[PDB]
Design a protein around this ligand. Structure first.
Ligand SMILES: *Cc1c(COP(=O)(O)O)cnc(C)c1O
Ligand SMILES: *Cc1c(COP(=O)(O)O)cnc(C)c1O
Lengths: 379, 378
């Protein structure tokens, strides 16, 4: 059956295994797993390639159908079909939202640290950005936007959220989402919720909650970004979708997208459909494997005498506080000890490193031993 | 190689979905009904069977074969740093309009033309100067220095298309150097769309890139190329833009970041396999399209109200239907079983665009529908 302990060689076109191509450094940085795609995804792609023709394609009605069924059955959120807008990636959906829902004098609000494109998009669009620092509470990274009221200027317009949160891995609860909703209403902000990791919730008894499912007011003021790219390791194809219930906001979004952003690949539609249509047993087995990998990394990091890490509620990263080392560059430090992490400076906190434990357990054990060898003793 | 194969498409093809339930032959969108070359299909399945579809790097193989293809086929030496890979060509046109013109500046192209040539400036707030094509020696020629006094002075980007999309014109040396001097005379940056360059049908005539005329041409130009049209893989859209100028290349890349994503992982492999091992398949396609073209041109000029120039580059198809006395010639042929591209989309509603990129048996069934509709439907 499913065997996530398989080790592949790349020796491919993967950006992950080519940054440290000819160096003895373990790639554990970019947010993709080393897992072979589900059989349903590969078999669907083969049936489409053997079809022969690759002309201009239409948007997948099958993907829109399986996406609606998934949002209603797994998250309790009924989706109207015309709310969907398919995109070639999630990063492009973040940029279009900023260019379309903000003007030159208006600003954006998000958390810090966060997925780098969240404050890179206002930077490229000529928009100033307001950042609210995440604070640790009960071994969880929580967001307190209400404690940043007086730091605002009235120019704020677009609220950029991330649930589950990259890189912290926090799965926001219902009370915390309703607090972020009340913050958006009190300041009359538009919300852009990035929910790419919604399928990777590991905590039992806790369900991912879409922001636009809280009420009809949240739905009419927000845009929801979702994709099976990270759930099924098909980011190299990049089939995603945006859910905009507001008709006027959808027209402003599509007008900003038209011509500048192309349509989704013909083969990317086939993989994204098979991922959400029949890949669920594969995704179930990956969660158990990732939780076992997560628990090992979490217990190992807390024993080392210079690192702190919150157990991520959502796989598969990986936020390690390396401020206890005292080095001027924690990411460059681990690189000279054969460990290639994502530098936290790109996320807005040069004291952290992002750990990608989305890999076979044999490779994780070798990474954990290089961490033990690096800190002890001594360096 | 055998292009007379009849492939059925009730699938995701945009071509055959527009008239999926009706008895109308689809001959409108600019893709062919031909099966992709075996080298492209084998390369995809080899990449699919690897299993992992994570983030990919820029194909150095596609960059290598693109540099060699420009030298062998067109006599144009490309530096590796000039290449910028894009997911599609329409996105490249929109980036060039927004990175090389400001709100108070205008663009110049021909008319009729590929619709995104005047839509992209319209959707970007730029005014557009259209230079009409006149019929000269049974060829749609472009005369830019005839509209000199019609230019305001805000023109900055010249939008070329070699070969032409509806007209199918393949420009010569004396013609391309004329529009280069026209761009030098008015300090115009050039965006040359050359996605049909591998589909030249005239014997003894080579496609000539705009930036290959002189070093000054290369420092002011943007060349868009892709195997999407020639190898029928527009559903993947692995394109590339060459920009010899470092300043214009920085503006282009800055205008792309975040908005336009990277090229698909599978799109890199298919485009790499196309230009590396697909030339025998393309050579067989050119002979097949040249025979289909001559059949259409002979039949369309024997018909009464229609006229058409023989296109120099496949696979359309620009038929003049003004001699029919109808308002919408595309709607007229639609109710008689023929789905063409209305010339109104291109800037001349009196025309219809025939897409003869199909097996010859299907083309003959489309020509008979033209006779029955014209002998005599009125
Ligand atoms: C990985 C990641 C993405 C991926 O987006 P792509 O455009 O498919 O590369 C989007 N959002 C977040 C928060 C991510 O971590
Ligand atoms: C068909 C056509 C294209 C197609 O561009 P894609 O992005 O590959 O779909 C581009 N330019 C011209 C002139 C065309 O006729």
């Amino acid at each position: 059956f499913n065997f996530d302990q398989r080790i592949d060689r790349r020796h491919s076109d993967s950006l992950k295994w080519k940054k440290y191509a000819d160096r003895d450094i373990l790639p554990l940085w970019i947010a993709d797993t080393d897992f072979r795609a589900a059989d349903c995804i590969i078999d669907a792609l083969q049936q489409r390639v053997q079809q022969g023709v690759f002309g201009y394609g239409v948007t997948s009605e099958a993907l829109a159908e399986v996406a609606i069924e998934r949002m209603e059955s797994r998250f309790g959120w009924k989706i109207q079909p015309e709310w969907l807008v398919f995109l070639p990636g999630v990063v492009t959906g973040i940029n279009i939202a900023v260019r379309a829902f903000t003007e030159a004098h208006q600003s954006t609000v998000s958390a810090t640290p966060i997925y780098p494109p969240f404050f890179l998009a206002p930077k490229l669009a000529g928009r100033q950005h307001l950042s609210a620092a995440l604070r640790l509470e009960q071994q969880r990274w929580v967001l307190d936007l209400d404690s940043h009221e007086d730091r605002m200027s009235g120019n704020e317009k677009l609220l950029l959220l991330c649930n589950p949160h990259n890189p912290g891995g926090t799965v926001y609860r219902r009370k915390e989402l309703e607090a972020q909703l009340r913050f958006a209403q009190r300041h009359d902000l538009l919300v852009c919720s990035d929910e790419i990791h919604c399928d990777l919730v590991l905590e039992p008894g806790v369900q991912h909650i879409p922001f636009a499912s809280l009420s009809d007011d949240a739905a009419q003021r927000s845009i929801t970004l979702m994709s099976p790219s990270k759930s099924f390791n098909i980011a190299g194809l990049g089939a995603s979708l945006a859910v905009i219930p507001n008709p006027e906001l959808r027209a402003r979004f599509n007008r900003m997208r038209k011509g500048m952003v192309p349509d989704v690949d013909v083969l990317a539609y086939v993989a994204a459909s098979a991922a959400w249509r029949e890949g669920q047993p594969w995704l179930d087995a990956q969660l158990d494997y990732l939780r076992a990998n997560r628990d090992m990394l979490a217990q190992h990091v807390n024993r080392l005498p210079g690192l702190s890490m919150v157990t991520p509620e959502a796989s598969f990263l990986g936020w390690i506080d390396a401020s206890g080392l005292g080095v001027a560059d924690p990411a460059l430090f681990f690189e000279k000890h054969g460990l290639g992490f994502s530098s936290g400076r790109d996320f807005g906190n040069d004291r952290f490193v992002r750990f990608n434990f989305g890999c076979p357990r044999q490779l994780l054990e070798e990474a954990l031993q290089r961490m033990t060898r690096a800190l002890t003793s001594g360096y």
